[PDB]
């Protein structure tokens, strides 16, 4: 209700642009301003310009003066960032926000995009079974890992099977690798259970990849 | 210089008062600067517009104070939840200048980086990698000590570390370390150490394993 | 009879001039328009009630600064619009009485067709009000002055 959705993840080479779009309904929209943020990670969140969806009349910022194309369709209420110069280095999450016609402020924000330069051409994942080695009690301060090595999508789901064992896992963030790769990686102590589920099945399950049983992960060491 | 903020990082006790402040670089209008929060991969969400003004939806123990050349923030009380980065906007003049802003996390006490050992894959191997990992668990600060030897000679130039966001049980950390050798400079040495040395003024902890065992 | 502005620094009775710091509009696109409310910022009080029933105007009222080149209109006192730059004394209205009356005007600026960027910048000068004081007991008249200064940036998106 009165608020406002946009598409989800756009990951693309460098290319020409994303050019995102930003649809809104619920309030008397057409009639008020709208601008746009973009937050590069763990930085500052330097605000870019803005577009009237009375007028258009979009301008923007110096800094980003080159890379902003912002217009509104009216009928449907759907604002589009478009980007004039590709980004190449700005993996940004682009936020579309409105601006209220009393005390002047941005509020009911965008639920944003994330943006991502790199161009390995859709790699799949695979599985690097770590090894929990010495004694492990077969099962407790000893963690073992579903460690993904290679893949280009980011949104890589390489969590378990709802939850590992009595659940509680650290999967990590993204990587960059240090080629031009994305490897992150998953932990789970394992503290429950001793040899008798050994399932240990953490679905990959990322969009253009499989299940991966994980060959039963072998707890053994050598 | 049209804006600016310090420092990069307050951390909160449940139940503590925190203060934020955003200095510029002229005094500017008064009561017009407004204070956003934005989670990790979330929506910002307006908390500030102008000096003492609430947004839509805001708490009342969230507040603000200032005058016109540096403005600030008070949170009077704590319940985790607001872990966000917060920053200041100008609307002075154009251009806009959201500030640097501060990731706010959450205040407890020293957490030890427990460390562990991982080996890489057999088949791995088949491609040439040999990827051994190392895996710090539970500390606070997003930076620890550690160390990276094989066969106890000092690499470095090779080793990687990867960090976790804030936690959401106990505000923790994790890290993980990864190296790129290959399978014949894995086969090149015996000895594989990771060491961190957190806790290094009593006795550090250096553990490692046997390679082929 | 002694008036007062938001941040409560004005002038004292006899004239004087004051400077007072008003709030905007960011964004104002060619067409709906800003109320530069004075109403919520200026007032004035008959520091002598009764038997002496004041008489309050808006002798000169001029737009020059950022507005002669922006953001700029009429004027509105007490629901009577006027030609702004003022080009002649307003009909009179009277206060009479112990409340700081607010101050019937409002300036009904309207942005230049040639437009450009940020049309009005934070501190430069908008507009100047002049008061006239008449009474009912002699003929002294006094002119209270007041400097609007916007502490902030106006600028009307422009597209093409």
Not at chain 1, 124 to 130: A, E, K, M, T, Y
Not at chain 1, 139 to 168: I, M, Q, R
Not at chain 2, 165 to 182: A, V
Not at chain 2, 184 to 201: M, R
Request: one cysteine or more; glycine letters at 8%; proline letters at 6%.
């Amino acid at each position: 209700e009165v608020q406002l959705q946009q598409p989800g993840p756009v990951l693309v080479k460098p290319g020409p642009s994303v050019k995102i779009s930003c649809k809104a309904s619920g309030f008397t929209f057409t009639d008020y301003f709208i601008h746009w943020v973009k937050q590069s990670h763990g930085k500052s969140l330097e605000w870019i310009g803005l577009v009237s969806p009375y007028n258009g009349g979009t301008y923007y910022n110096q800094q980003f003066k080159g890379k902003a194309t912002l217009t509104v369709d009216t009928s449907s209420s759907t604002a589009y960032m478009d980007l004039n110069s590709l980004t190449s280095e700005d993996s940004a999450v682009y936020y579309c926000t409105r601006l209220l016609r009393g005390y002047w402020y941005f509020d009911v924000w965008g639920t944003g995009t994330t943006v991502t330069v790199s161009s390995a051409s859709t790699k799949g994942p695979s599985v690097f079974p770590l090894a929990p080695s010495s004694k492990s009690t077969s099962g407790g301060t000893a963690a073992l890992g579903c460690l993904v090595k290679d893949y280009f999508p980011e949104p890589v789901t390489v969590s378990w099977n709802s939850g590992a064992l009595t659940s509680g896992v650290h999967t990590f963030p993204a990587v960059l690798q240090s080629s031009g790769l994305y490897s992150l990686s998953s932990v789970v102590t394992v503290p429950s259970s001793s040899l008798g589920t050994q399932t240990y099945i953490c679905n990959v399950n990322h969009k253009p990849s499989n299940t991966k049983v994980d060959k039963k992960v072998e707890p053994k060491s050598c | 210089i049209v804006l600016t903020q310090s420092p990069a990082l307050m951390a909160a006790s449940p139940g503590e008062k925190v203060t934020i402040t955003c200095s510029v670089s002229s005094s500017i209008g008064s009561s017009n600067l407004h204070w956003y929060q934005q989670k990790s991969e979330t929506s910002p969400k307006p908390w500030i517009y102008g000096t003492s003004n609430l947004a839509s939806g805001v708490p009342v123990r969230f507040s603000g104070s200032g005058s016109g050349t540096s403005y600030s923030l008070t949170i009077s009380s704590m319940e985790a939840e607001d872990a966000a980065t917060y920053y200041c906007q100008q609307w002075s003049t154009y251009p806009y200048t959201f500030g640097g802003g501060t990731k706010l996390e959450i205040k407890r006490t020293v957490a030890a980086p427990s460390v562990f050992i991982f080996p890489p894959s057999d088949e791995q191997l088949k491609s040439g990698t040999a990827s051994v990992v190392c895996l710090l668990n539970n500390f606070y600060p997003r930076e620890a000590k550690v160390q990276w030897k094989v066969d106890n000679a000092l690499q470095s130039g090779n080793s990687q570390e990867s960090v976790t966001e804030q936690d959401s049980k106990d505000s923790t950390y994790s890290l993980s370390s990864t190296l790129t050798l290959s399978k014949a400079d894995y086969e090149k040495h015996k000895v594989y150490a990771c060491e961190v040395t957190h806790q290094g003024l009593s006795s550090p902890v250096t553990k490692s394993f046997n390679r082929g065992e | 009879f002694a008036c007062k502005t938001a941040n409560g620094t004005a002038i004292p009775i006899g004239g004087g001039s004051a400077n007072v710091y008003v709030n905007l509009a960011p964004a104002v696109n060619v067409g709906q328009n800003l109320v530069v409310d004075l109403s919520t910022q200026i007032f004035c009080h008959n520091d002598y009630p009764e038997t002496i029933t004041d008489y309050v105007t808006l002798q000169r009222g001029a737009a020059y600064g950022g507005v002669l080149s922006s953001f700029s209109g009429t004027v509105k006192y007490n629901g009577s619009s006027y030609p702004f730059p003022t080009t002649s004394e307003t009909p009179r209205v009277v206060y009479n009485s112990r409340t700081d009356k607010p101050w019937p005007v409002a300036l009904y600026l309207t942005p230049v067709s040639s437009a450009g960027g940020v049309a009005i910048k934070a501190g430069s000068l908008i507009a100047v009000l002049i008061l006239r004081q008449t009474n009912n007991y002699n003929s002294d008249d006094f002119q209270f002055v007041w400097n609007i200064y916007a502490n902030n940036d106006v600028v009307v998106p422009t597209g093409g």
